[PDB]
Amino acid sequence: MAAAVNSGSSLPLFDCPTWAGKPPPGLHLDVVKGDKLIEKLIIDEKKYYLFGRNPDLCDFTIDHQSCSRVHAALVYHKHLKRVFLIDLNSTHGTFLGHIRLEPHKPQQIPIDSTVSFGASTRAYTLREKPQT
């Protein structure tokens, strides 16, 4: 995995919106191959992350050749207090379980929800550290 971005002069890997804020210490991401939890991640640290393969740019890694360095990026709403998945012109596209997302337009992410990126057939189950 390398980076040979020659397009344009120099561009970032994402652009945090203005609806982004700060998530409380009680959130965390997840992944499901279908009916089995693969791994788990945290999302209660920043207000916007990434999702591709190259960590040198993104914070996470889809772990798929199909995907791209910056397949997409997440964003934690503030006025909604939820999450969002911005399909950064994903090679294929991003979905929210059974919904399709635009390659630019963000799509909120409910708790115990499920999202499926282009290749990664996973079912990113966005959870939320409930009551103990």
DSSP state letters, 20-61? B----SS-BEEEESSSSEEEEE--SS-SB--BSS-TTTSSS-
**Dihedral sign, CA of 62, 123, 112, 13?**
positive
Report the length, in residues, of the chain.
132
Cα(93)–Cα(29) distance, integer angstroms: 19
> How deeply is 98 buried, as exposed, middle or buried, from its count of CB atoms within 10 A (0-12, 13-18, 19+)?
exposed
Q: Are 85 and 62 in contact (CB under 8 A)?
A: no
Query: For residue 103, what are the domain limits?
Result: 1-132
Cα gap 79→101, rounded to integer Å: 20
Distance CA 61, CA 52 (A): 5
CATH number, position 11:
2.60.200.20
The count of domains in the chain is 1
CB 54 within 8 A of CB 70: yes
Distances in Å between the Cα of 128 and the Cα atoms of 23, 41, 49, 109 are 11, 11, 16, 11
Q: For residue 37, how far is the Cα from the chain centroid?
A: 17
Cα separation, 39 vs 60, whole angstroms: 12
Residues with Cβ within 8 Å of residue 10, at least 6 apart in sequence: none
Note whether 104 and 93 are within 8 A (CB). no
**What DSSP state is assigned to residue 66?**
S
Whole-number Å distance between alpha carbons of 87 and 71 = 7
Alpha carbon 34 to its chain centroid, in Å, reads: 17
Structure tokens at 65: 């050749």
Dihedral angle sign, alpha carbons of residues 71, 76, 77, 83: positive
